[PDB]
Each structure stands twice: as C-alpha cells, then as structure tokens.
Amino acid sequence: REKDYVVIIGSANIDVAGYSHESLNYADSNPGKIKFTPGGVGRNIAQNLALLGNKAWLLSAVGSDFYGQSLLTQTNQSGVYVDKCLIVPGENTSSYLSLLDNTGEMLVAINDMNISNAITAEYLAQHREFIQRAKVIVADCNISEEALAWILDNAANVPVFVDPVSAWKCVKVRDRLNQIHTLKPNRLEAETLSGIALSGRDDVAKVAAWFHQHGLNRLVLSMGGDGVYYSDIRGENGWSAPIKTNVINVTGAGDAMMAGLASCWVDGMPFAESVRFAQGCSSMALSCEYTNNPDLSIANVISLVEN
C-alpha cells in the first residue's frame, strides 16, 4: 500500500576494505586494492528492504564530513529514504575498516562507531508519530540501551524486529525480550543471552524455551551448517536446512536475513515460509561481492527458493 512504510533504526558505516596485491612489507606502502562501500547493520537492512520493494526510512547518524554525505547519497540511490537521518555537527562518520588477505581472508578490523550514540531517545522522539505509524520497526543493537528502550517503550503496538549485531552488543535486549516481536540471534548470541550452552542441535529446544519464558514472541536462531531453528511462543517451531550456496563473501548475509523476515511479515506471509524466504535473501547476499547484492528482489529470491 502506497502509504505503508518501514522504519529502520541503526548504524550507517563506511566500510573500508583494503588488501595488498602481494605479501605485506610493513617497511613500505604496498600496491593493493581499496574499496569504500556503504555498511552498518541498520543501513544495510534498510537497503535490502528497499530492494525487496518496501518504502524504507532510515533513522541513523552521520557526521558533517562530505564522506558522510556520500554515504547518505548512495544509500538513497538504492531506494532508501534518508531525509530523517541525523547529521552530527562536525563529527567523524562511523566506519569499519578491515585489512583483508591477498586471498580475501580477514586479518584485522578496526571499527569506529561512537556516533551511534548520537542516535538518542531525544532524536527518536522527534519522529515519534512517524515511527508509530510504520508497518514494522527494525532496530539494531549498535544503538545505546537507552535508545533501544525508548523504541521498545514507544512502539505503540507496531512490531519491533531486533538485530542483535554481535555477542557484545546483543546483551542490551536480555531484559526486554517481552517487548520484541522477532529476534534473530546466531548461536553465540543466543548462548550469550540465555546463559545456556548450545553444544548441538539437541540443545535448541531448551534455549528457545528460555527465550519464550522471558517473553520473546518469535525466535529465529541461525545455527550455521545446521540451518535455522525457528520458534513462536504460541507453540510452532521447526528446523529449516540451509540452502546450498556458492559463497563469495560472507558480509551482509544477516542483514539480508533480517530484511527478508520483516518484508515477509509486512506482506502477510506465515512464519515458517517467511524464515525459508529470508534464508534465500541471505543466500543472495552470500553469493555477491558486496555487502548488499543489488539483484536482491522478491522475484529473484523466490526463484532461488524453488530450487
């Protein structure tokens, strides 16, 4: 519907990936390749929602530094509405810098994301009515605990989908599971939140039971080669095997996952079929060089899934 839109609250980064063509020198500047790409979990999810055909508004923060403007401009080009993003007077725009291998393997990564703290409850409250009229809200855990609490306290019965981002950053959701419609942790995040070891497939039922006892509506638990375990507090649960994928670069798979889950909810799709769809979204991120595959589309995901 032409007035239906989705609101994403999370980080917008410039990802910088550099690798040397040959063996590193340290004692010299080495000819290599350097790529600047848009990143940040929330920004990536928003771009994926746009590619999936939703009107997606990003609520985020960048500095005033020209490169922050390029970030916002490029994310607009892919379909995202960036007009409510906060510009932070004279601040570095967040970035995530990785040194990769001559063969594409990670070495060391620096992340500089303090301006995520500029995504305050005060900022979000300036868009209260807009947020409260979205079809769904996606929040990432890069934002502060106070900002996440504000979203969950003021969602006004709009479902909030939460991306835990990392084992470090996920813990702010632990006491607010009863306010979250859908949570999408990996194995380490679910172990970290629950305090229960996930040693194998046999352990997911007791971990899911812990999440539901603490009030979580829906769990979408990614278990790597084991596939995805999904669980609804009303009783439905199940496993979905992974989709055989030729993996090109792993970055952005979970951001595509989350977009697929939220897009399918907005489109009226049932839970289990939404999890399988989102697995196909992630598969298209996995088979692409960039962290957002610009061939992400409803049509392209369905064809992948039918295989």
Ligand X SMILES: Cn1cc([C@@H]2O[C@H](CO)[C@@H](O)[C@H]2O)c(=O)[nH]c1=O
Question: Which residues would be at the binding site for K ion (CB under 5 A)?
Answer: 249, 251-252, 288
Across-strand partners of 9? Answer: 59, 139
* Shortest distance (Å) from residue 106 CB to its own copies: 9
Which residues, 6 or more positions from 105, have their beta carbon under 8 angstroms from its beta carbon? none
Residue closer to K ion by CB (options 115, 281) is: 281
Task: Give the x/- contact pattern for ligand X in 32-51, rule: CB under 6 A.
Answer: -------xxx--x-------
Q: How does DSSP classify residue 81? A: B
97, two tokens = 């810098």
Residues in the chain: 307
CA atoms within 13 Å, Cβ hemisphere of 280: 21
Residue closer to K ion by CB (options 61, 288) is: 288
289, two tokens = 């060089």
Partner from K ion, ligand X, its own copies, none contacting 15, C-beta within 5 to 8 A by type: ligand X
Residue closer to its own copies by CB (options 39, 260) is: 39
Which residue lies nearest K ion, judged by its C-beta? 249
**Burial classification of residue 199, based on how many CB atoms lie within 10 Å of its CB (0-12 exposed, 13-18 middle, 19 or more buried):** exposed
Find the binder of ligand X among 5, 115, 177, 255 (CB under 6 A): 255
Residue 262, SS3?
helix
Residue closer to ligand X by CB (options 140, 237) is: 140
Which residues are near ligand X by CB under 6 A?
A: 11, 13, 15, 29, 39-41, 44, 96, 111, 113, 142, 165-166, 251-252, 254-255, 291
